[PDB]
Amino acid sequence: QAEILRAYARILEADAKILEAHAEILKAQ
Amino acid sequence: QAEILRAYARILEADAKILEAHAEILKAQ
Amino acid sequence: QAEILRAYARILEADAKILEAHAEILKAQ
Amino acid sequence: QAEILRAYARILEADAKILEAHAEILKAQ
Amino acid sequence: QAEILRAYARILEADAKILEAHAEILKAQ
Amino acid sequence: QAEILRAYARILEADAKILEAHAEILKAQ
Amino acid sequence: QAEILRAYARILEADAKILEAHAEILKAQ
Amino acid sequence: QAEILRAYARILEADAKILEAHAEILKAQ
Amino acid sequence: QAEILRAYARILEADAKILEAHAEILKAQ
Amino acid sequence: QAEILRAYARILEADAKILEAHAEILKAQ
Amino acid sequence: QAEILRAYARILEADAKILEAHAEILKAQ
Amino acid sequence: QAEILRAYARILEADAKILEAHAEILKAQ
Amino acid sequence: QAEILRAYARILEADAKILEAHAEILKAQ
Amino acid sequence: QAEILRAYARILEADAKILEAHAEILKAQ
Amino acid sequence: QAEILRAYARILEADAKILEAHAEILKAQ
Amino acid sequence: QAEILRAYARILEADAKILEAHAEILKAQ
Amino acid sequence: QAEILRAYARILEADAKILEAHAEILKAQ
Amino acid sequence: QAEILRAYARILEADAKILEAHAEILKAQ
Amino acid sequence: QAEILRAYARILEADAKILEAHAEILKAQ
Amino acid sequence: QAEILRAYARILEADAKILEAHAEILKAQ
Amino acid sequence: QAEILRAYARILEADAKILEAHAEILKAQ
Amino acid sequence: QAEILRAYARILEADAKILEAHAEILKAQ
Amino acid sequence: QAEILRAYARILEADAKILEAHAEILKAQ
Amino acid sequence: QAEILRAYARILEADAKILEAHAEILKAQ
Amino acid sequence: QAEILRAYARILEADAKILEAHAEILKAQ
Amino acid sequence: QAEILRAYARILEADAKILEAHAEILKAQ
Amino acid sequence: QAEILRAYARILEADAKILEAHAEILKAQ
Amino acid sequence: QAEILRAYARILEADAKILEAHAEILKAQ
Amino acid sequence: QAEILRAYARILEADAKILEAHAEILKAQ
Amino acid sequence: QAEILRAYARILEADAKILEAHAEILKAQ
Amino acid sequence: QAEILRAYARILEADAKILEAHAEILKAQ
Amino acid sequence: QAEILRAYARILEADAKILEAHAEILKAQ
Amino acid sequence: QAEILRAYARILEADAKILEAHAEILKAQ
Amino acid sequence: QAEILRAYARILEADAKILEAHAEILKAQ
Amino acid sequence: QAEILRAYARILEADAKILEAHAEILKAQ
Amino acid sequence: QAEILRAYARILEADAKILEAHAEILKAQ
Amino acid sequence: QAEILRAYARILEADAKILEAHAEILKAQ
Amino acid sequence: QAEILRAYARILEADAKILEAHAEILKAQ
Amino acid sequence: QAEILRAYARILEADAKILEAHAEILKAQ
Amino acid sequence: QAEILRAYARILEADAKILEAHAEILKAQ
């Protein structure tokens, strides 16, 4: 496992912080 | 499990946070 | 279970959050 | 149960939120 | 592993810290 | 490794400290 | 190595202290 | 080396102590 | 060297002691 | 050297004491 | 008489906050 | 008499908020 | 009688804070 | 009776802090 | 009776501090 | 009765300090 | 019973100091 | 019983001093 | 039993002084 | 068993003095 | 001329803020 | 002439804000 | 004349802050 | 003249902070 | 005159600090 | 005058420090 | 007068340090 | 009267040093 | 009276030195 | 009277040195 | 493309926001 | 490009923000 | 560029920030 | 540049910070 | 430069810092 | 300079530190 | 200078230190 | 100077030390 | 001086040492 | 001085030593 399926959320949460910052590099570009 | 089926929500919640950010890179593109 | 049958709502609530965002990527596409 | 019959409302409420967004993806199709 | 898949969360965490800083150089450039 | 894959985080953390300082030189330039 | 890849952090940490001081000379310049 | 690559940190640390002092001479100049 | 490359630190440490004292003659000047 | 480059540190070590005391005679001047 | 009957308004105001909260539990039940 | 009659209006104003909430609880009855 | 009946308002205010929190638990349940 | 019934408000205030914390655990569960 | 019932608030206050901390462990789990 | 039930708060306070530290060990894990 | 249950707090206080240090060793690992 | 359990705190206090020092060897490693 | 378990604290106190020095030998290494 | 274990502390106390002196001659090396 | 008549606007703007508040005191009176 | 006529508009706009509030005081008269 | 009549605006602004607060004391009275 | 009428603004601003706090003493009363 | 009326602004300033604290004693009473 | 009325400000500030501390004793009571 | 009323400030400041410490004894009690 | 009331400040200052230490004995008790 | 009440300060100062040291025997106990 | 109470200050001054050293023989025990 | 035809919709969407604002400036012409 | 034609949307979007601001100046003029 | 045409968006964005600020000055003028 | 045209954005950014500050002076004027 | 045009930003930044500070003096005036 | 124009920023920076301090002297005035 | 214009910054820096000290005397006055 | 203008900084530096100490005689007054 | 104007700094430095001690004589008074 | 003005510093230096000694005998008085 129940944590094993729960652990991918912490993986996939970090995939947002790539992308929501990836707009910011275009924002003041 | 009742948590095992509940834990997929925490998976699927962050799946949205990809996509709403995935528009934001195309927003100020 | 009464919660077991209730728990699928928290699944299915987030199931919309893909799709209402999955148009927003198509919105400013 | 009286809540067991009441619990399906929370299921079927979110069943709409799929579909009313599922036309919004066809809006900017 | 359960930590092995959990360890990449610490890997990808700082990958955002590159990019949000990598806009800040473009900010006052 | 589990530490070997963990060790690159300490590497990649310091890559940010270049860049967030690399804006500060351009900040009061 | 595991230390060999770990040792570059101590190298790269000091690369910040060049640069964050390299703004301070331009600060009261 | 493992010390050979480690020893440059002690070299590069003192390079900061030039520059953070190099602001101080310009500070009360 | 491993000492030969290490020995320049003892040179470069005292190079700071010129400069941090070089502000002090300008301090109470 | 190895002492030859090390001996210059002892030369430059005293060069601070020329200067760090040079302020002191300017201090109560 | 002025504030004494005024005080029951603050009493009766909180009675409204029970009942909608006593209804809000019935909504997502 | 000006405020004494006016104070009951603040009393009866809260009496509405009971009853509509008392019927709002019948909506999700 | 001024504060004595005013005191139950502070009592009854926190009674609402139970129930909406007693509702929020069933929301993400 | 002024403070005696006032004290239960401080008792009942923390009961709300249980339940939303008893809710927040089920959120990221 | 004044402090005797006041003390349970100090008991029950820290009981909230368990549960949000009992939630934060599941967040980065 | 006054201090005897007061002391458990000091016991239960440190019980929270376990768990957030038990949480922080998973963060950099 | 006053100090006897008080002393366990001093025991349990140090148990927090283990774990954050047992976490800090994971941070720069 | 009072000091006999008090002494384990002094035992466990020094156990924290190992681990942060066991982390400090990792930092400049 | 009092001093006998107290004596290990004086043992374990000196165990910290190894390791922080065992780090300090790595710092100027 | 009183000083028999305390004597090792006097042994291990000087063991730290070796290592910092093993560090100090590495400092001005 | 141009600003002098604009100055009375900033006067007369705040002249309403009495009156719209001067009903609010009569509102919950 | 262009702004001078427009300046009275900013006057006469705020002349309404007296009066529409000046009936609101008659609302709870 | 420009600032002299402008100063009454700063006077009359705070005249409102009496009255909107003067209702708030009557609000929870 | 100009500062003298501005001085009462600093006076009359403080008259608000009496009164807006004067409700707060009735708020948790 | 100008400071003499400004002096009461410092006087009445702390008069609020009585009352907002004089509610905080009533807050957790 | 101007200091004499300023003197009560230093008096009346300390009256607050009684009361805001006078709540803290009742806070963790 | 001017010091005589100033002297009670030094009196009344110390009345706080009784009370803010008087909570701290009840804090870890 | 100037020093005679000033002398109690030196009296009352040390009254705090009892109590802030009086917590410290109960702190590690 | 000036020294006679001042003498108790030298009494009461050392009254603290009992108690702050009285924790120290409980500290490393 | 003036010295007679100062004499007890010298008495109680040494009473700390009994106790503050009493921990020291317990410290390295 | 299908996006190439979709992209001009984002172009022409902004073309509306020019003109209504370009006529909004004619409202306060 | 497809982004090249998308880029002018970000150009033309800011053109709207001029004109309403070029109108908002005309409003309070 | 594609960034070159994107670069004027950052130029033209700040051009709007002039004008609304160039309007806000005329508001409180 | 592309940075040359980007550089004027940093120039024109601070021009907005003049004018609202050039407005805020007229607000409390 | 490109720095020459960047340098005026550092000039014009502090020009904003005058005016808001030139406003704050008029606030508490 | 390029430093010559940078030098006035250090001049104009301290000009702001006058005025807020020139403001703070009116606050407690 | 270039130092000549830099030297006035050291002059004008101390001018700020007068005025806040010229305020702190007015604070506890 | 260039030193002649630098010398007045050392003059004016000590002028600050009067005034903050001039406040300290008022604080414990 | 150039020393003549520098010499008054040594005069004015000791002027501060009067006053802070002239405060310290008030503290334990 | 040039010594004539410098000699008063040696006069005024010992003048501080009177006053702190005038304070120190007041401390243990």
Author numbering:
A (entry chain g), B (entry chain k), C (entry chain o), D (entry chain s), E (entry chain D), F (entry chain c), ...: 1 to 29
From the paper:
Here we report seven high-resolution cryo-EM structures of filamentous peptide nanotubes based on a cross-α supramolecular architecture that provide insight into the designability of helical peptide filaments. A structural interaction is identified based on an appropriately placed pair of arginine residues (RxxxR) within the corresponding peptide sequences. This local interaction motif, designated as an arginine clasp, is robust within the context of these cross-α assemblies and can guide the coalescence of helical protofilaments into structurally defined cross-α nanotubes. In contrast to most structurally characterized filaments based on synthetic α-helical coiled-coils, the chain axes of the helical protomers are oriented in a plane nearly perpendicular to the long axis of the assembly.
Therefore, the designed series of Form I-like peptides encompassed minimal peptide sequences in which the structurally determinative distance between the RxxxR motif and the C-terminus was systematically varied over the range from 2 to 5 heptad repeats. Three filaments, derived from peptides 15-10-3, 29-24-3, and 36-31-3, were selected for further analysis using cryo-EM imaging with direct electron detection. Five protofilaments interacted to form the 15-10-3 filament, four interacted in the 29-24-3 filament, and three interacted in the 36-31-3 filament. The Form I/29-17-3 structure fits the observed trend, in that the 17 amino acid length of the structurally determinative segment lay between the 10 amino acid and 24 amino acid segment length of 15-10-3 and 29-24-3, respectively. Similarly, the 4-start helices of 29-17-3 and 29-24-3 and the 3-start helices of 36-31-3, passing through every fourth subunit and every third subunit, respectively, were associated with the axial stacking direction of the protofilaments within the corresponding assemblies. For the 29-24-3 peptide, the interaction occurred between the C-terminus of peptide (ia) and the RxxxR motif of peptide (ib + 1), in contrast to the C5-symmetric structure of 15-10-3 that involved helices ia and ib. First, the tilt angle of the core peptide with respect to the plane normal to the filament axis became progressively more negative with increasing peptide length. Despite the differences in cross-sectional geometry for the respective filaments, the helix crossing angles were remarkably similar and lay within the range from 95° to 105°. The length and flexibility of the arginine side-chains enabled the conservation of the RxxxR lateral interaction between protofilaments despite differences in peptide length.
